[PDB]
Design a protein around this nucleic acid. Structure first.
Ligand SMILES: [Ca+2]
Ligand SMILES: [Ca+2]
Ligand SMILES: [Ca+2]
Ligand SMILES: [Ca+2]
Lengths: 269, 267, 269, 267
DNA sequence: TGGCCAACAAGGCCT
DNA sequence: AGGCCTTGTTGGCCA
DNA sequence: TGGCCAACAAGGCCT
DNA sequence: AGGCCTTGTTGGCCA
C-alpha cells in the first residue's frame, strides 16, 4: 500500500474520491429529515439565511461521519474542512477533506470561486466562441510534518453539497422549500488529462461574474456534463411526499461501463 | 458498491480486514511513545497489572482513530468494540470492530476464549495426535435495523493487540519489547485459512483439561504469518527511538514478503 | 475562583462532587432503556458476564456526557477514568473522574478494594467489637504539568454505579433482570472529619474478604448509612413496568437540611 | 437543583454565564499559540481574510472544550453554536452556547447584528440626543422535548470573541495584538444591565441610516467592564511568550477588581 | 462615538 | 448557457 | 507446544 | 452485617 497519494495510479485516486463521496452521501441521507426541517422552518430574518443554513446543515450532517483525525488545522473560506487519515485498501491515506455548501434555486450547474477550483480549467464560451482559462485555486495537497522523517502530502479532495430549493417564504411555520440535495465530487488536479484535456472536452462553463462590470471572474460546473464524464461524481438526494427523508439513491457505473442507480439502506442515527 | 459484506468476494472481504489492521497499526505506532511510558513506569498493584496496562493502552491508542460511528453498542467479553461505517471502495461497510488486548512474556502464539474466536476451529493435537474442535464464539455479523427496510448486517472484524514484555526490577518496573497486532480472518474465510485439521494456525489451548477447565484455544504467530504475511504485524522497541519502529509487513506485486518502514505523526 | 481544589472550602468541594454525580445520573437515566436491554438480553456464556456488562453499560452511558478533556491518561484497575476540566462557579477545576461499576443481587452495601477507597476508613466490627482500619488507596489528586509554571493538582472524584439485579438466566431471550441502578458519590479524603471522624461514626462495614482464609482484606459501604450522612450521595434509578427507562428520581437535601426527592425530565439522546 | 433556568435567581443565572466564560477563556488561552500562527501567517485571499481567520480560530479552540452534548442542533447567523448540558451546582442545566467571532483593528467596542443581540437594547444617541431602541434577536431559550413530559427550556448564553489586530506588511502578514472575550447578559438580566436608556453598555450601530441600511448595534468594552468586570476578558500577546498572557479578570470577596494570572496546559 | 462606505461573497433573475 | 445586477455580511475608516 | 497452576478479582450465599 | 467459599479471568511457568 501507499502513504503518498502521488504513488497511486489515477484509477486508485478516483477510487478514494469515490469512497469519500459515498461516505458523505450516507451522512446527508441519514441527516435529510432534520435538514429539511432546519432548511425550511428556520426564520429568514431578511434574506441571506439560506447560505448559512446550507453551511450549517452540511456541517452537522458531515462532522458526525468523520475519520481518524490528524492534528493539523488551517483557516480559509472553505466551509467545511478536516485533515484526517482515510483508511482504504490503497493504504491509510492522509487527506484534507474540503467541501463547500451552496444554496440555489437552480437544479443544474454550480458556481465556483477560483479558490474552490480543484484543477486548471479551459472551455469555449458558447457565445464568444473564444477559449476561457482559469488556474486551480485549491492546492493539490497539504504537507504534513512526520515525526520520523520529512514531509508527507495530505491529499486534497474537493466536494460540493448543492441545496436546490424554492423560495416560498413565510406562510405557516415554513419559510422555504428544500427540493433536493446534490453532492458533487470534483476530480483532483492529477486527473486533468482525463476530465479536461481540451476546451471542447469539459464540464466547465461561463462564470456567474459580470465581465462588463469588470468582476473578478468565476467558473461554472454543469451537472449533466459531469454525470456524463463520470456518473458517480454527481449524486442526488431528492425529497418527495413519500418520506420525511430524501430518497436514498446512489448513482454509480457498472464494471461494464454503464450507468446504474440503486437504493440503499440508511439508519436513523 | 455494496452494503452487505456477504455480497463481497473473499478477496474483497480480506481487503477490509487488511485496511482495518493498517489503521490500527498507525494508531499504536503513533501512541507507542506514551504506551512505553505507561507500560514500563506504572507501579504494580497486586501483580497481574500488565493486564490492565495492555487493555488501557489499546483503548487510548485506538479510540482516537475511529470512523463514522453507528448508533448501536456491543457489550460483552471483548476489550475494545465499536460499531461503525468503514469507508471502502467496495462500499460504505457497516462494521463491528472487535479488538482484544493481551499482555504476555511470550513472543509467539496468543490465547483466545471461545468468545473471542472468529471462526470454527479445528487442529490436530501434537501430543494426543487427535483432532480438536471449537465452534466460533464471535458472531459473523451484528444485524442493524435500517430506517427504510429490513436488517443490515454489520461485519465483525477481529483484531488482537499483543504486548510482549519481560519483568524487570531504574524507575521502570518492566520492559515492553514490542507490540504485535493480529488480524484473524472472518468465518467466511474458513476454507482459506482452516479448511481441515492439518491446515491451520490454531493450537491447543492454555486451559487445564485435567482440572476440567472450560477449554480455550491458541493462534500461532508463525503459522498465521505464513498463511498471509500481512495478518501479523509487529511494532518493536529499540534504543534507537522512544517510539516503536514503524514497520508494515506486506507483499510485493510479485507475491514476495516485504517489510517497509512508514511515516508517522506526533499525535 | 480557584484552580487548586485545596483552596476550595469543604462545602464547595462537596458541591463539585454533587454536580459531578448529578451529571452522571442523567447519563445513566437517559441510557437506562438501552442498559436494561443490554443487561438482560446479552448471552451469559457461563457466568462472569454481569461484571463485564455492568462496566460496558456504565462506559457507554457516561462517555457520552464527558467534559473539556485534558491531554493526560493513565492505566489502572478502575473501570472508567478521565482527566478533564470541570466548569463550575468555584472555577474551572481540573479533575480525574473515577467511577467503578458493580453488579450485585443485593440492593444495599457495596464492596470496595483498598485501591477504590477514597479516604482512610475506621469502624467497629459489630461481631468482634474491635476497631477496623484501612488506608485510602485512591490518590487525592493527579499532578498535571502546566506550560507556564509548575504542577496543578487534578482533583479525584470517586463514583460507584451499582447494578442491582436478579438471576433469571436463559428463558425466552432474557438471561437476567435489571431491577435498579444505584449511583454512589464517595467523599474526597479532605472530607474525612465530616464523614468518618471516629469508628462509631461512619458508613463503612466489615469487608467481604475471608480473614480465616487469610484474604487480602476489603471494606464495605452501606447505602442506608451513606444516605443518612448525606442524602444526595446515594441515588437510585429504579425500573418498573410503567416505563422502559428507569424512574427519573433525584434525591437531594433542602437548604433547611431535610431530605427531598423529585422527578426530573430526561431526553432520548 | 433545577432544570429550568427561569427558576434560578438572577445571581445564579449570572454564575452560569460566568462559568461558561471561564471555560472559554481557558480554551482560547491554551489555543493562543496556534491562533497566533494561523492569524499572522495565513496568506490573504481577497482581503477581508481576517474574518474567516477569526471564525475558524474560535471553532478550533472551543470545539475541544465542550460538555455533555444534547441531540439537537441550532442553525443560523451565529458563528459557533452547540446545545448541551452544563454541569452546575444549581443543577445540570440545558444550554445553547452561542459565540460569535469578530476581527477588528479596534481595541474597544463590538458590533452586533440584531440576530446576535441577547436583550432588548435602549440607549441615548450621543449626537442625536434621542433614544435608540432594538429588540433582541436571540431567543431567551430553545425548547427541548423531554422523553417523559413537556418541554425543557435550554438557556441561551451569549459570548463574543474579538480579535484585535493591525495590518502589517517578515513571514507574517499581520499582527494579532490580543483576544478579548465578552459575556453578554441574558434577557432576564435587563433590569440589571440596561434598565433605561441612560444606563447601558450599548451604543450606536455601524450601519448607515443615510443609506437606509437595516440597523445594527454596538457594545462598548469600558461600559461592559464597569457594569461587571468579569464580563470582559482579555488575552494579550507580548514578546514574553508565544501564548497570550493567561489573565483572568474578576473581583475580590471585598468587591475589588482583581486580575490574576492562571495556569494553562499545552493541549 | 457615529455612521458613511468599501470589499466581497452569494445568488436571483432575465435574456 | 450567459452574465448583469441585486442583496446582505463585515469591518475599515475618518469627520 | 501442551497444559497444570498461580494470582486475582468479583460476588453468591448462608448464617 | 459478617465473611466463607464458589466461579471465571488471565497468563506465568515448566516438563
Ligand atoms: Ca460556500
Ligand atoms: Ca484481553
Ligand atoms: Ca469494578
Ligand atoms: Ca461573526
Amino acid at each position: 500500500m501507499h502513504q503518498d497519494y502521488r504513488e497511486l495510479s489515477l484509477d486508485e485516486l478516483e477510487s478514494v474520491e469515490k469512497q469519500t463521496l459515498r461516505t458523505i452521501v450516507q451522512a446527508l441521507q441519514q441527516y435529510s429529515k432534520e435538514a429539511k426541517s432546519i432548511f425550511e422552518t428556520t426564520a429568514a430574518d431578511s434574506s441571506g439565511e439560506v447560505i448559512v443554513l446550507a453551511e450549517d446543515i452540511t456541517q452537522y450532517a458531515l462532522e458526525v461521519a468523520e475519520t481518524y483525525p490528524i492534528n493539523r488545522r488551517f483557516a480559509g473560506f472553505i466551509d467545511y474542512k478536516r485533515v484526517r487519515w482515510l483508511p482504504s485498501p490503497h493504504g491509510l491515506l492522509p487527506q484534507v477533506l474540503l467541501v463547500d455548501a451552496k444554496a440555489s434555486t437552480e437544479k443544474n450547474r454550480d458556481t465556483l470561486q477560483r479558490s474552490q477550483l480543484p484543477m486548471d480549467a479551459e472551455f469555449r464560451n458558447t457565445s464568444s466562441g473564444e477559449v476561457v482559462t482559469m488556474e486551480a485555486g485549491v492546492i493539490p495537497h497539504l504537507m504534513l510534518q512526520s515525526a520520523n522523517d520529512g514531509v508527507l502530502p495530505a491529499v486534497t479532495t474537493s466536494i460540493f453539497v448543492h441545496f436546490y430549493y424554492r423560495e416560498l417564504k413565510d406562510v405557516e411555520g415554513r419559510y422555504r422549500e428544500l427540493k433536493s440535495i446534490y453532492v458533487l465530487s470534483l476530480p483532483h488536479a492529477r486527473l486533468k488529462q482525463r476530465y479536461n484535456p481540451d476546451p471542447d472536452t469539459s464540464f466547465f462553463g461561463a462564470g456567474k461574474h459580470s465581465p462588463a462590470r469588470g468582476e473578478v471572474a468565476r467558473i461554472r460546473v454543469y451537472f449533466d456534463r459531469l454525470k456524463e464524464a463520470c456518473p458517480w461524481r454527481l449524486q442526488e438526494l431528492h425529497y418527495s411526499a413519500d418520506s420525511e427523508y430524501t430518497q436514498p439513491r446512489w448513482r454509480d457505473l457498472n464494471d461494464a461501463g454503464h450507468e446504474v442507480t440503486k437504493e440503499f439502506l440508511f439508519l436513523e442515527r
